Symmetry: D2
Subunit: 149 residues, 4 copies
């Protein structure tokens, strides 16, 4: 067991809990969205070489986006997004409606989905997100992160 500082758990209490674990760095991020984030997958770096992380896909006919990071010079500086219930869902729980990834080279990805509901921001001054935790039912219910130096 190493263990990373894990802050997070942003969004719904529903869906199905999952945890990618901690790696070496973020190399790329995939995720479908529409009026909210559906699928979400990530490609971590593990000691200089790419490592395909576990998939958290969503049947929803959402929009796919590959976020290619200029790793390792570039890495996330902050993660933001919105959470809230969904018109289109049977369940009245909340979910990741939006998601915005900002990098240290001033690049910005998204916002994806809808910027509706309670906002959440994780400004990182020192350290790197090295892991993603979350819950996905029919779509990204919630999400959190792992960090190290």
């Amino acid at each position: 067991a190493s263990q990373t500082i894990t802050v997070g758990s942003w969004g719904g209490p529903g869906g199905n809990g999952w945890d990618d674990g901690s790696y070496t760095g973020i190399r790329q991020i995939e995720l479908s969205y529409k009026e909210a984030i559906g699928s979400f997958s990530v490609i971590y770096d593990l000691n200089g070489d790419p490592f395909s992380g576990p998939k958290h896909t969503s049947k929803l006919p959402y929009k796919n986006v590959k976020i290619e990071l200029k790793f390792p010079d570039e890495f996330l500086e902050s993660v933001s997004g919105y959470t809230g219930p969904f018109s289109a869902l049977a369940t009245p729980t909340p979910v990741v409606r939006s998601l915005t990834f900002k990098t240290n080279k001033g690049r910005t990805f998204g916002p994806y989905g809808d910027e509706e509901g309670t906002y959440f921001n994780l400004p990182i001054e020192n350290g790197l997100i090295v892991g993603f935790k979350g819950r996905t039912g029919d779509l990204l219910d919630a999400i959190g992160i792992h960090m190290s130096l």
Copy 2:
């Protein structure tokens, strides 16, 4: 020069800047609140013994509070709070209007201040807050935190 994962900078870019540093843990948090957050000091733990952190006191006549944590068994599990502009102030920049400290033993401190503006939540899953960064002018502009395992 040891460093620590430092997430943060919730609040405005105004006031004068500061950073308490990284310690062993949090033993107690003192602060003054009214329609916003002013004074904010804290007593960190330094290898078992109490270390009085630098002062960040606001002239304003707010109501004071002592947050005595049942260290080392208890320690913050979360930090909520609000930020945004504010009347009664010549400056238009945003500041901490309210704070909320949840702890691992299920005890809740606050909300302190007016819950006005944009909410922010730092939910710690695994890890400890060990320091406070921030900005204070006439009162508490912003706030950030140092973390470690």
Copy 3:
């Protein structure tokens, strides 16, 4: 880039430098030996599941040994071994003549090879070795480790 505390670099200045990188934990260790450690490979744990690490095999007709750890309850508590030049080598540089892995459940592996030359001991009171660094020419020239909590 995460990065782990890396202490080490025990043994010869020769051979060919290599680095396994940092993982999640030690799950098993393979290595050939005779009058010194020849081959050395390791199976790390990466978020609950086994991950075959890079191979550092040696042509030498040495003795093979698989060190199966009762992971995750069990993990190395200390690493010791000897370094020194080798009768059987052309080069007059030093190498990992011996190697002794001790676990937290009081189990002991080895010593492997020869307990000759300058001894080296890494007693760990808090933390886990999560990575191996080293140099291997015709046999394990040197070795070090990565650590986290």
Copy 4:
């Protein structure tokens, strides 16, 4: 209660135990040596400012030394030293007979004491010493260290 990777316990099980703790860095190390190591104090850095660490002084009449590190640019890169029994002592347990501090700027302190017994080397590749654990009776029995990034 923050913790730190703590490797160590080089020396004997005798004398009375101690542990300075984890700080921000090492600024200066004081100590007394003759045919062995006696007194051993240290001034750690605490977020930019000097923090005088607890005293571990030995009655014996040894020669004293101030190890003034050119912090924060300079910090130890290695710790060598010897341990083993010792004459002039009723107790048969082992103790630190000598110490050697190498630094990142290529400066070397010591060897201090008699180089008698079993050598030990803590070569830091990546990381910082931030604390000292150990045991001291009439003089310095053993020594260990806290580390962090």
